[PDB]
RNA sequence: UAAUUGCGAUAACGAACGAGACCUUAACCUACUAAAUAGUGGUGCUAGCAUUUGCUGGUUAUCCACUUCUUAGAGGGACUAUCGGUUUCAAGCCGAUGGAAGUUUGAGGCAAUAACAGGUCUGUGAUGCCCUUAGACGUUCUGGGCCGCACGCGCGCUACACUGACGGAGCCAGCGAGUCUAACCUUGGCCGAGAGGUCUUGGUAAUCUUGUGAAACUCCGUCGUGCUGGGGAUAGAGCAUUGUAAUUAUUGCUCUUCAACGAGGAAUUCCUAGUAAGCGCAAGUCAUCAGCUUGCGUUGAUUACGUCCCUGCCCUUUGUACACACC
């Protein structure tokens, strides 16, 4: 908490690019395309776009 | 002159020399005229200024230039050896103190004295180097007016900075004595010497 | 090499040679004379004193004069 | 108007403590002729004197002269700062000088045979006569008179 | 009430804001008159839109000035401009356009600026150079 | 150079080609009839393409 | 369990580094990162920003 | 190499692209490098609308 | 001496390898019909005046 | 009719202010006024040791004429400036600090000045109306 | 009632603009004060990079940006529409808090 | 044309990439929406002079109004608009008018096909192959070095001084950054000559640091052309902080020592307007140090508006014993 709004959104960035590496990583079978982030006041929701979800 | 008085109180000297005639500082541009052909549209004098500061744009045309006036073309000459750029408004003082002392010296019009410096250290005659294979040798042309007269005004700069450099004279005093010498054929000058020298030169590679 | 006092000859010499200008300044002196230059100073103020010149205009790094009258 | 006419009185080039200093000059400067003391140090001494320092050196007579010499040789005792010394809190005596003229460089001396004597890094720099404190050697210095 | 007006000068990025009201013609400052503007020499830069229009037509109105930014210099182009622009602003609103179009003609018969700002700017360093235009140096061997 | 490029050139064409009862002589009123009758992406090229079709119908009626 | 291999150091080139290969050649402190811009600019838009002049 | 950039590419286009590209690039079946480059319908390089219309 | 004035006429190019040269006719400025060619340094325009020293040269193209 | 130092120019007020000062003559000078440079990126002393201090003074009440409130790091900032670094390229430095906190001091032991809430001081209205006063000097100087 | 203070952030500032329209527009439909957004100096985050990794060619940099935009509104009104307009108005690439006063 | 930009011409026709277009930035907006983290003005309350009502001030919200300055959303605004002259009288160019703006408005960004054995395995947990791998090339901890000095070269900083050094005072910018599970920016107060110390305070920021009162620059005055007081190297003494740390001096403060250098030979780089040049400021490195760099703004020019003569580039043509391509 109390964090400048300069340094919190340089973190969001480096969140969502660490996410992204990672999915790419992980998801590498199952055809990861993107990611989306919605951050909300309790229960922030991270949408995964790939082809198959029957394996994601 | 009819005074007009305000709550600022601006002394009557100063409403005196504006709602009269729009002089210089002290110095009137009426009677000044030039005194050789060539050398209007080239020198000009017929507005008036106060103070020669002016941040103009003159080097974006190939002559509006030569509509500024001859006097901030002087001063901002003098802001170079670079431990002086940037330095126009020492060249102003400078120039005050050099048309005090051509006035005081020389009562005339001041102004007319720098224009017949000018016109009379002006060279008539210039030199170009021929591709000529071989020597390459030197060709005498002539040369335009407002180049000429450009050269003119550094040649007189130059002497001045280079009298003053390692000497107590001040520029003022050095572009005072070097206007005077140029004014008249005098042949003392730098400015004169290097137009005969050029002229000379012309006159042997032709 | 200058001067950098008096001798009261230079003394004279001012006040009989300065008002032959209808210029005058500190180099003015320096050259016709031979001085200390600070000492210029002190003599232009010493002929601002009385009307043996009259200042058109001054400066710190420069002054101006010229005759009596 | 200073202008004052005064003829014999003045006294021209001069001398003192073993050193030359033109009378012709104003006498802060022209005390900076003398070793171990700058234009400052020069200010200071003068104004702890009473000086009107306005003048040329040929002035202030042998009064004056001696009172500067005393207020130099002797300066804590005419309320001198200790930081204001070149050479402070000495080494052995521990005590804070203005060594001068000819003791400057009696103590340079002093002090560079001392560590030369003892063979530190700094004394052997001094020795082979090396750029002392730690700068580079390789490209600067050369033309090495 | 007190039928003024309100302009601005500019320069580089000296910009100068300026009040002209109905009023007994003072003419000042950032507190301080205009008599005062002392870089001592360019006070006549700023005299002259006094005077291109003559003195006349200041002593029925009170004028107040300030600046900001800039350099020294900067400041007195946007105060020479914002004045021009706030007496013949003044003649817009208050008296008629033959007088105002005197007053224009005034100043652009003789026009330095005046009421056109220089829209010359500040030019971007381009890197591996010291300035926009100028570059390092280069040795070939 | 203050050259127009090709596709300016064509847009014009066709613009004067089959709107030729529109289109006056006045770049402002034909900037407008641009905005209003044209899928264009920015305005700058708008002003080249209606300064240009004034330039042709004017040589037009000139002949 | 011993004093004085850091003997002297806490200050200069050694306590700020990258956490992709530990350089410390004119890093960059600025939001928090110290990164070798060799490595950077090639982190360059993986961080998400984009440039436009 | 080639029926596998072609089926791409190929697939891509009847998805409704307006275009594609493929560079394959390295030691393919030797050691000196060369780049291979597959293609189709349209591509732009230099304008904005390469960050606007594209995913590379 | 014999000096001459002359106003341009007609500028005919920059002669010189390097272009620090221009040809110009000029009218010697008392004898109307006397229109002669001559080459020049600085920058110059029409309607502008030349002083000559040789009122006979003519010089011709130039490198 | 009327009067106040902003219609004073600076240095004329300033020096009339500071002789005026010493006229007086009841100022609380300090004793290490002699010695001090004034900063240490300053070349020398001043040249005047009699009354630059007198001359800063005088500056200091102007300033504060003008300025709300103002302190001493302000005032270092001021009347510091660029330092001769020799070899290396100059740069600003501040003046000294002791110098402005004494000025300010025996300031508001005249009562010209005072402490500001908000910080650092700003002027009384006796100053105020003194300097107002000597603005009136200043402009009845012309006879 | 309550006196609130309300700050929006964001890069993507179509989303930011439209996310403060509908705000302002729920918020006047049912008239709170009025507050207007105070659109503030937008803030840009200036890298200084060199374009090459090991600095073999030409000195090519690079200045990478985030060009970032902020502001408030604020509002007075009692607990239901606080809470609701709180939250129903949402949107990703949009950061968002809330003051009491 | 700046342009394979067009005019057109035409065994070519019709298409595509590139350039352009595009986006950014900076310049115009009294037209809109707003604003105690931007401003005003009046209103209260209040200081000072004058008092004749006024001028300068203060007062975080006394309240009111406004948005011109400020900021930022949408929009407008230039298209070479108008006139004139040019030209196959086309594409286009020149001049003038007006315009915030008339060089592609400026400066940028982006950036084609083909190729280099250009650089990089010392950016990468990208990486093939080889080598090593326990007395290891891994890892850790002891110091040192990378800085070692006859010399050569490169980028650069400071000077050679009067267009100057120095003492006072004036005082004017902007790009930016900034403390959480911590110790940034630090104001302000006190002490200290200074460097620094010390006690508090604002700030996760148009709120506080900060108007970052920067520099030069300006005005007054000391200086007097004397390697001079220009110059401040080198070298010495001590004080500060920085820091488990300072010797190989960190840096800075105090004092002393005052080198060389009088415009720099042959050779050679950069640049055409807010440009060069000077000027300093921030950021970058920063738990210290910039003489470095990226950007910023302040002061602010001379000269040209052309040529291919050098150095090379572009297109055509031509010649050729070259194709590793005139090295
Ligand atoms: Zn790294």
Redesign the interface.
Known sequence: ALISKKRKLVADGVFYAELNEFFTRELAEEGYSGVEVRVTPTKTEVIIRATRTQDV | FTPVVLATPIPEEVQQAQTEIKLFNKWSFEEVEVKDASLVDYVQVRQPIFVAHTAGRYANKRFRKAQCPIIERLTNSLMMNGRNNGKKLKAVRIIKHTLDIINVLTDQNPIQVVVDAITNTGPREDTTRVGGGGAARRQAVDVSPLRRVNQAIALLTIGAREAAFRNIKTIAETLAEELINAAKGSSTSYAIKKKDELERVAKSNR | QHAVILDQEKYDRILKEVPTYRYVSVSVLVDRLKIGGSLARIALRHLEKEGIIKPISKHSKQAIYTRAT | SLVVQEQGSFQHILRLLNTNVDGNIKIVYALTTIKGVGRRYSNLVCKKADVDLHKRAGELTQEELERIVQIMQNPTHYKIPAWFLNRQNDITDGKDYHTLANNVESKLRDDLERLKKIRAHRGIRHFWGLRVRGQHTKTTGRRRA | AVPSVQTFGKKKSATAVAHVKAGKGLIKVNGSPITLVEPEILRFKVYEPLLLVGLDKFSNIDIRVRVTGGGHVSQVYAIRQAIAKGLVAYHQKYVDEQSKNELKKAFTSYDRTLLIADSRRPEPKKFGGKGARSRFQKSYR | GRVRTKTVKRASKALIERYYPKLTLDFQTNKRLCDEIATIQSKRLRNKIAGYTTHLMKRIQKG | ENVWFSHPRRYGKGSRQCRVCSSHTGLIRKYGLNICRQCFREKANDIGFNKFR | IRRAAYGVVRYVMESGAKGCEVVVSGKLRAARAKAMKFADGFLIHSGQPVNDFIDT | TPVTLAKVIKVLGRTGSRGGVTQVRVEFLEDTSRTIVRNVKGPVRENDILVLMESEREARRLR | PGV?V?????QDFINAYASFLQRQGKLEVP?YV??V?TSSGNE??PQD?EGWFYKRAASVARHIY?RKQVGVGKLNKLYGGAKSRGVRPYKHIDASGSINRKVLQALEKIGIVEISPKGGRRISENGQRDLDRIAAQTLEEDE | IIKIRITLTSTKVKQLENVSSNIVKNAEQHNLVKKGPVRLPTKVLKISTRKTPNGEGSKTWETYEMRIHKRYIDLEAPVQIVKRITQITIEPGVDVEVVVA
């Open positions: 106040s902003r219609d004073v120019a600076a004793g002699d010695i440079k020398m002393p040791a003008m």
